[PDB]
Design an enzyme around this catalytic site. Sequence first.
Site, short mmCIF file in Angstrom:
data_model
loop_
_atom_site.label_atom_id
_atom_site.label_comp_id
_atom_site.label_asym_id
_atom_site.label_seq_id
_atom_site.Cartn_x
_atom_site.Cartn_y
_atom_site.Cartn_z
N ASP A 56 -9.34 4.01 -1.52
CA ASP A 56 -10.20 4.39 -0.40
C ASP A 56 -11.53 4.91 -0.94
O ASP A 56 -11.71 6.11 -1.16
CB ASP A 56 -9.51 5.44 0.47
CG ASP A 56 -8.29 4.90 1.16
OD1 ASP A 56 -8.29 3.70 1.51
OD2 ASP A 56 -7.32 5.66 1.33
N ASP A 110 0.85 -1.18 0.00
CA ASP A 110 0.00 0.00 0.00
C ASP A 110 0.89 1.23 0.00
O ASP A 110 2.08 1.16 0.29
CB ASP A 110 -0.94 0.00 1.22
CG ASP A 110 -1.85 1.21 1.27
OD1 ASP A 110 -2.22 1.74 0.20
OD2 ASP A 110 -2.19 1.63 2.39
O1 LIG Z 1 -6.04 15.31 6.36
N1 LIG Z 1 -6.01 14.03 6.94
O2 LIG Z 1 -7.21 13.43 7.35
C1 LIG Z 1 -4.73 13.35 7.10
C2 LIG Z 1 -3.57 14.12 7.27
C3 LIG Z 1 -2.33 13.50 7.43
N2 LIG Z 1 -1.11 14.30 7.60
C4 LIG Z 1 -0.15 14.09 8.55
N3 LIG Z 1 0.80 15.04 8.35
N4 LIG Z 1 0.42 15.79 7.31
N5 LIG Z 1 -0.73 15.34 6.85
C5 LIG Z 1 -2.23 12.12 7.41
C6 LIG Z 1 -3.38 11.35 7.25
C7 LIG Z 1 -4.62 11.95 7.09
N6 LIG Z 1 -5.81 11.08 6.92
C8 LIG Z 1 -6.15 10.11 7.98
C9 LIG Z 1 -6.47 8.68 7.41
C10 LIG Z 1 -6.89 8.64 5.92
C11 LIG Z 1 -5.82 8.00 4.96
C12 LIG Z 1 -6.22 6.56 4.55
C13 LIG Z 1 -5.09 5.76 3.83
N7 LIG Z 1 -5.64 4.51 3.29
C14 LIG Z 1 -4.58 3.53 3.04
C15 LIG Z 1 -3.90 3.17 4.38
C16 LIG Z 1 -4.80 2.36 5.31
O3 LIG Z 1 -5.80 3.21 5.84
C17 LIG Z 1 -3.96 1.83 6.45
O4 LIG Z 1 -2.82 1.22 5.93
C18 LIG Z 1 -5.50 1.18 4.62
O5 LIG Z 1 -6.51 0.70 5.47
C19 LIG Z 1 -6.17 1.61 3.30
O6 LIG Z 1 -6.78 0.51 2.67
C20 LIG Z 1 -5.18 2.29 2.36
O7 LIG Z 1 -5.81 2.63 1.16
#
Ligand SMILES: O=[N+]([O-])c1cc(-n2cnnn2)ccc1NCCCCCCN[C@H]1C[C@](O)(CO)[C@@H](O)[C@H](O)[C@H]1O
EC number: 3.2.1.207
Lengths: 83, 854
Positions: free
Chosen positions: B528, B452
């Site tokens: 996602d 991923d």
């Molecule tokens: O703005 N924000 O919400 C935000 C800001 C920051 N930042 C930090 N520092 N800067 N920005 C970091 C994150 C977020 N989002 C929070 C979660 C949504 C992202 C999902 C990713 N999905 C993949 C990973 C996985 O979730 C687990 O491996 C798998 O389950 C999935 O299948 C995968 O596709």
Amino acid sequence: KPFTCLDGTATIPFDQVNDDYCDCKDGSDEPGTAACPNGSFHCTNTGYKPLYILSSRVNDGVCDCCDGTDEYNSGTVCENTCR
Amino acid sequence: VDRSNFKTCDESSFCKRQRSIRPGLSPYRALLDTLQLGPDALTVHLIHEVTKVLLVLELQGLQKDMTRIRIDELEPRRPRYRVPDVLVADPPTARLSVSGRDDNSVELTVAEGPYKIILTAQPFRLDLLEDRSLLLSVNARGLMAFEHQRAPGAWEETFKTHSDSKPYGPTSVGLDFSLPGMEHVYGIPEHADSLRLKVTEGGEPYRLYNLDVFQYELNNPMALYGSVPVLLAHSFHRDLGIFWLNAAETWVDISSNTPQTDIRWMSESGIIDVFLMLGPSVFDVFRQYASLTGTQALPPLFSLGYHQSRWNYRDEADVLEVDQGFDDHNMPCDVIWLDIEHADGKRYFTWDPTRFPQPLNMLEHLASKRRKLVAIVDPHIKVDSGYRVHEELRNHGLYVKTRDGSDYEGWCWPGSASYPDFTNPRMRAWWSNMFSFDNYEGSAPNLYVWNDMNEPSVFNGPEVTMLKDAVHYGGWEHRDIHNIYGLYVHMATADGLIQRSGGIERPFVLSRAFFSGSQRFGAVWTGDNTAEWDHLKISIPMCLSLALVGLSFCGADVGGFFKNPEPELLVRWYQMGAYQPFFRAHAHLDTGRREPWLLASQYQDAIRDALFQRYSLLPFWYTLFYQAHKEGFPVMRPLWVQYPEDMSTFSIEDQFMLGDALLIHPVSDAGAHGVQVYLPGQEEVWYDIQSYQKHHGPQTLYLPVTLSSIPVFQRGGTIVPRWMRVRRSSDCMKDDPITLFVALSPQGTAQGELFLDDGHTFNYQTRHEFLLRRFSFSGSTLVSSSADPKGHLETPIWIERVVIMGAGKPAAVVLQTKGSPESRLSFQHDPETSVLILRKPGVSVASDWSIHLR
Ligand SMILES: O=[N+]([O-])c1cc(-n2cnnn2)ccc1NCCCCCCN[C@H]1C[C@](O)(CO)[C@@H](O)[C@H](O)[C@H]1O
Ligand SMILES: [Ca+2]
Ligand SMILES: [Ca+2]
């Protein structure tokens, strides 16, 4: 004498009992195989409680009965764990 | 989605420069005095009339009716990027001959015809013909643009707070293509958009740049996680395909026009390298593309079962409770997935010492249930001197570097992290070796891998990815290689699962980012998505767009990744997913638990029904994937692929087919009471597989549905093999007897195939240990013969039942097979539905046999 399904759906010769093909709608003709989708296999399980399992778990390679009788032709050798 | 994080074409300086060039008189012309005609290639110089820049055109006719166009600078200051490791071989060439010549044109014949290529000198132009039919034009609207390399937003460029130093300046390349007679084009995933690609005239071009788009939205051309630069054109008369082999950021314009479609490719760097695949049928295009980039890897059988996943399962006990939940509620499942919380603080290849202290024991418990496990391994490595993986990659110089020679550091799940240079073959060999059972401690043969965030996703990077001016192996910039970075991760991981077994076991790797050729390494999914009804609908056109460009092992998160689906939506998603190639339920960290037995009994039963149908159809799925592996034909197919002359199917995307045998129309509306099913085909019949009712095509049938309905129809003239003994996992089933479903055509015929092997090794290719059976019905006889005699297999699989749809009542049924006396079979017949059930044939699936209906 022929065998009668416990739901009366049919009558078959006893050579079609446990012949690995489902002939009764209730599965009553295959108590020892995995042939019927609605059948049951009885673990006698001496030393523990005897339980019934799905026919789909006869010879699936997984030890379901503690006495191991459900795996007799799958390559999985199951030990007695009824203790 | 927050669009301001991602560039529009206007905010991309090379897209803005290229797209400001509008159709007109091209300044490029071919210097026919420089022409040299070789066996494998014709070379001729091109010149820009204004800048006097000299280019070299390398035009090649290829075997299988394909043409390859390559344009590079004649005298480059520094070499341009040519995409490696995507082509499975050097394509065999065909000879070009001069068959006509004047002061402004040279006609070229491919081998002995009938394909010809006309090179016009000024303005530079290429036309492709079969005999006298014009197939395709190159640079007909004069949009060719080749920014040559000048002395080291045109140069130093900033987006938000990120500066691209751009040491080489403008280097973009572009070219347009004209498709006379075509009004429908398809492909170039990945986009959350319709199957039929829309015109970009009044809006944004389609973008191909592997990007992590948070909470992406539907029906827009924003670039998603993967990029496959392949466009297919379909009309009543022919099928064509364009393969733009470029790994840099690419924009695609589509415009309509006697009906004609124009296609324009605009890439940031690299050479012009495009394959023209001339059909004439869409299956000819499949083979042509497969000969260049390979075919779908044969999935191990278990990976075609049901996958149960979420972010995250708490610990070993939770995983074992989920395993037991499936068995206690009579639901099949092959794989349980461990997301990023299973590792030690998102240090991959490790295990959390409190929640996963004994991974081998957990894998042993699942192996005793004959189930698998998948662990996530991302390509970002925590910057941590106590982390062995980071220390080895740092000490061996295997990290992506910045222009100052330091290892690039960005932000991701574990905080500060570096990114291995997967374009470096030494790095990929290192990665593959890390999956050995001695290096990846706690892993076992029933542990598989999920790649991923391999776009790569960089939380503090521009557009949430790596800086353009990062430096890779050989000095190439990240802008040169971006769209194959994920492919290299997928490849190295798939190789690692093969090498850890000594080359015997087939791998299973899921990947989020992908490129041309990613079909050779496993599965992908659409990232996602969201627990909404429109996201359920769009899973069909998205995986269909991937199927058309070689990626058959596609799926979407069942139930939606974001948010909590209503129980009815979750049921409709299991029914949809049960008939799609990659079948996995997945969920966001903050969603409620939605394992299928946690719903009310009515919803549990419909989900169990859907799971049983999928597991019963595993022999059929396995055969379709074997056909995809050998021929390059997609498993999931649009209706127009099977009916190329029924123009009412050219845009259908609420309906799809599996091979040529099953037409699927899942219910995708809350509270629906019926669906409109288009049953196509003149002289064609279709059988409702639930009621056995026969329907004549073409027609639009209104079919009432309940919560347990999955509208599925079998085409007349096909034979579908099933395992009607549903067990808890596919490993439990792979020696069980087969039931053959024969759907008779109006001529009383049917045919089908069946592939079998051990289910998980390469013995089918290294030892020819497999079976390929052909089943055929005609007259009143069903015959099993070998469709490939070199395959032999020791297997106890036998034929336990034959179901014939559309048959009359016979007087007697007779089975013959060599080595056995003639046998009489008993049977049952329903006169209302014309269904014939043959009881217990009892013949080995490896034996030739024939059943006659007297
Ligand atoms: O703005 N924000 O919400 C935000 C800001 C920051 N930042 C930090 N520092 N800067 N920005 C970091 C994150 C977020 N989002 C929070 C979660 C949504 C992202 C999902 C990713 N999905 C993949 C990973 C996985 O979730 C687990 O491996 C798998 O389950 C999935 O299948 C995968 O596709
Ligand atoms: Ca029987
Ligand atoms: Ca068992």
